[PDB]
């Protein structure tokens, strides 16, 4: 109904997680998207380049033994399964496979 609000000698209890560690910061160097390096370039050129590369270079274009047998061709007509995402908790494919695997 209402959370605790968290407003702010000093106590001398020292936590283990509060001991010195990672005591200097990494900064972005030349080569890791540093700010002075990135004013120099046209990021729209590189984005439209990479998007065009992706979007084109994904498109790829510039009587027998079985005579008494009562049923014939019963696999033909079966649906081949597809890489798809269903946003359903219980009706997606991971879940149907999971329940198939673990419940016998």
């Amino acid at each position: 109904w209402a959370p605790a609000i968290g407003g702010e000698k000093p106590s001398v209890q020292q936590s283990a997680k509060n001991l010195p560690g990672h005591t200097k910061l990494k900064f972005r160097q030349t080569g890791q998207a540093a700010e002075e390096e990135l004013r120099a370039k046209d990021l729209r050129a590189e984005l439209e380049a990479k998007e065009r590369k992706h979007f084109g270079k994904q498109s790829g274009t510039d009587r027998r033994w079985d005579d008494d047998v009562v049923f014939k061709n019963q696999a033909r007509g079966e649906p081949k399964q597809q890489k798809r995402f269903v946003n359903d908790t219980i009706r997606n494919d991971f879940h149907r496979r999971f329940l198939q695997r673990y419940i016998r």
Partner: protein, 120 residues
């Protein structure tokens, strides 16, 4: 517990879809199947299994086999619940009077077409 719930949602839905999407077995798959079975059973000179006769020579041996089987779950049993105690009571009754157990069983097979809830 979570997986029995998840399985039972899936299984409730499978049972629903059967009643909506109808018998999956096609009317002329079922008939080819029924007919294959008929021609098999007739090739085998098979005779149906009849309803357990009244003066059936084996009726009480089969019931005693049944009851032995049902009792066997209770030969290590250390603490029983009301359905396990009720089961042991009815096993004892059917050992004590096999003839009225047999008559109840045959009345069940003859008449009973609606049954209680199964726990899963």
């Amino acid at each position: 517990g979570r997986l029995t719930r998840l399985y039972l949602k899936a299984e409730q839905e499978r049972q629903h879809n059967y009643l909506k999407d109808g018998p999956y077995v096609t009317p002329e798959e079922a008939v080819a199947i029924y007919t294959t079975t008929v021609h098999w059973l007739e090739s085998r000179k098979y005779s149906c299994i009849p309803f357990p006769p009244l003066n059936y020579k084996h009726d009480t041996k089969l019931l005693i086999l049944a009851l032995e089987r049902l009792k066997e779950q209770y030969v290590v049993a250390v603490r029983l619940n009301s359905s396990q105690r009720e089961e042991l009571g009815l096993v004892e009754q059917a050992y004590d009077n096999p003839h009225e157990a047999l008559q109840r069983i045959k009345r069940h097979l003859l008449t009973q077409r609606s049954f209680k809830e199964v726990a899963i």
